[PDB]
């Protein structure tokens, strides 16, 4: 009777994973992150979390940072101090002894690599690069005085050559990093353990386990719009590798999807709206970067993209958000296919130059006028709004399990309980 749930955005972020994650967190017994670094979820139990999973506020819930993450131990301690200063207990935290460690040379490397390009702040990329190269320092290494110093000496030998000779800049001595960072590790040691054992024990004993993806599917390093992606795998498959659990133990995957598409980046965007409709969707949907203030690009729901997400991330359940934003639009469109070089295709091209030539083939649906912001069940939707929601499910092949008609908690309507099998 396995009871695990993965929650992930199906698009390029800003899908509203936050509200759904908060909900599923309440009913979880264990909550785990499985990839990424100190990237941010904004809750008021006002709190913002970066590395620590969202179950931390509940004393009884075990929170796991899996082996798939890269951890800045300094930033992690800042995040812990932040919680403690707000009266939040963190004894429920578990940190993987196999997670990789972000060190000061990763931050400098990050800056230097970014400034050399003409086409990335916290050293996450460089940490993942060291992992692939097999020179990375792991949490277990940081906890060993002799091993930490030795790997630090070996890596700085190479990193300092890179800084001094390729980038004409100062490197780091071993003593600028060693005692400072060893001490950080000592403060984290109480949480460090075999997290694969922790998770498998919880899973095998039928506990409710929630895995939280940090970025959206289209930002996946393998399956997203590479290279404008994150440096890891937020797809549900990433859970298996990122925490060390078998694929048979990941039961349900909730894909969080918005009723329309949004993008922050500048890449190809088949269903983009440049007109008054996109203006209305943007204004009503408040599609502006919360920290940057920059407007997001908006466009129609793209079911080619979402079916792609269903395949690569094994989506089983759909949470459809921001449905209210489409009110008062007489003709709604959903992209069902792409016209490319004169051919009709149903795949997301891996080549962005090909993605850029893709014109959407769309279904038109009639819109509605009623304020659906008060709606609390499918039966309360006006006919055209329900038919729109049903069509999204039908087109994507994913069963509806939640829909949202506003930003509030009570405006998330549960159609199906994803913890029960």
Q: How far is the CB of 222 from its own copies (least distance, A)?
A: 5
Rule CB under 8 A: choose which of 103, 139, 334, 402 binds its own copies: 139
Q: Is 18 in the site for its own copies (CB under 8 A)?
A: no
Q: Of Cl ion, its own copies, none, which one does residue 264 interact with (CB within 5 to 8 Å by kind)?
A: Cl ion
**Binder among 253, 277, 318, 326 for its own copies (CB under 8 A):** 253
**Considering beta carbons, is residue 291 or 351 the nearer one to its own copies?**
351
Candidates 10, 262, 316, 413; binder of its own copies (CB under 8 A) is: 316
Q: Contact between 101 and its own copies (CB under 8 A)?
A: no
Binding string, residues 264-293; x marks residues near Cl ion by CB under 5 A: xx----------------------------
Told to check if 349 binds its own copies by CB under 8 A, we report yes
What is the SS3 string spanning the chain?
Answer: CCCEEEEEECCCCCCCHHHHHHHHHHHCCEEEECCECCCCEEECCCEEECCCCHHHHCCCCEEEECCCEEECHHHHHHHHHHHHCCCCCCCCEEEECCCEECCHHHHHHHHHHHHHCCCCCCCHHHHHHHHHHCCCCEHHHHCCHHHHHHHHHHHHHHHHHHHHHHCCCCCCCHHHCHHHHHHHHHHHHHHEECHHHHHHHHHHCCCCEEEECCCCHHHCCCCCCCCCCCCCCCCCHHHHHHHCCCHHHCCEEEEEEECEEEECCCCCCCCECCCHHHHHHHHHHCCECCCCCCECEEEEEEHHHHHHHHHHHCCCEEEEECHHHHCCCCEEEEEEEEEECCEEECCCCCCHHHHCCCEEEEEEEECCCCCCCCCCCHHHCCHHHHHHHHHHHHHHCCEEEEEECCCCHHHEEECCCCCCC
Is 194 assigned a catalytic role? no
352 binds Cl ion (CB under 5 A): no
Binding-site residue numbers for GTP are 13-19, 40-42, 296, 322-324, 404-406
Q: Note whether 236 binds its own copies by CB under 8 A.
A: yes
Residue 87 interacts, among its own copies, Cl ion, none and using kind-specific CB cut-offs from 5 to 8 Å, with none
**Active site (annotated) includes residue 119:** no
Query: Residue 11 interacts with its own copies (CB under 8 A)?
Result: no
Of residues 180 through 199, those in contact with its own copies by CB under 8 A are 194, 196-197
* 104 counts as binding Cl ion under rule CB under 5 A: no
Annotated catalytic residues are: 14, 41
């Amino acid at each position: 009777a396995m009871s695990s749930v993965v929650v992930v955005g199906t698009q390029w972020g800003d899908e509203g994973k936050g509200k759904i994650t908060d909900f599923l967190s309440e009913h979880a017994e264990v909550v785990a992150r499985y990839q990424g670094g100190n990237n941010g979820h904004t809750i008021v139990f006002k709190y913002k979390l970066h590395l620590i999973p969202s179950g931390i506020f509940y004393k009884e819930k075990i929170c796991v940072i899996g082996n798939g993450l890269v951890v800045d131990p300094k930033a992690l301690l800042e995040e812990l101090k932040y919680l403690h200063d707000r009266g939040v207990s963190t004894d429920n935290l578990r940190v993987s002894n196999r997670a990789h460690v972000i060190l000061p040379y990763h931050l400098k490397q990050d800056e230097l690599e970014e400034a050399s390009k003409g086409d990335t702040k916290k050293g996450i990329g460089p940490a993942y690069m060291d992992k692939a190269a097999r020179i990375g320092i792991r949490m277990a290494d940081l906890l060993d005085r002799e091993a930490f110093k030795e790997k630090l000496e070996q890596n700085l030998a190479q990193k300092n050559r890179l800084f001094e000779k390729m980038y004409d800049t100062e490197g780091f001595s071993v003593d600028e990093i060693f005692e400072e960072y060893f001490e950080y590790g000592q403060q984290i040691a109480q949480y460090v353990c075999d997290t694969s054992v922790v998770l498998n024990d919880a899973l095998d004993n039928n506990h409710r386990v929630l895995f939280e993806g940090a970025q959206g599917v289209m930002l996946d390093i393998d399956h997203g719009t590479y290279p404008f992606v994150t440096s890891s795998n937020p797809i549900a498959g990433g859970v298996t590798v990122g925490t060390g659990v078998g694929p048979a133990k990941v039961t349900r995957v909730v894909g969080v999807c918005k009723a329309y598409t949004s993008r922050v980046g500048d890449g190809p965007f088949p269903t983009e709206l440049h007109d008054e409709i996109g203006h209305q969707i943007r204004e009503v949907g408040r599609e502006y970067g919360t920290t940057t203030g920059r407007p997001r690009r908006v466009g129609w729901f793209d079911s080619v993209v979402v079916r792609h997400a269903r395949r690569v991330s094994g989506l089983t359940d759909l949470s459809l958000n921001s449905i209210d934003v489409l009110t008062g639009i007489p003709t709604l469109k959903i992209c069902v296919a792409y016209k490319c070089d004169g051919k009709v295709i149903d795949e997301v091209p891996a080549n962005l130059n090909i993605l850029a030539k893709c014109e959407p083939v769309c279904e038109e649906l009639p819109g509605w006028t009623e304020d659906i912001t008060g709606v609390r069940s499918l039966d309360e939707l006006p006919e055209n709004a329900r038919k729109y929601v049903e069509r999204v499910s039908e087109l994507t092949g994913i069963q509806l399990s939640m829909f949202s008609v506003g930003p509030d908690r009570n405006q998330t309507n549960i159609v199906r309980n994803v913890y029960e099998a």
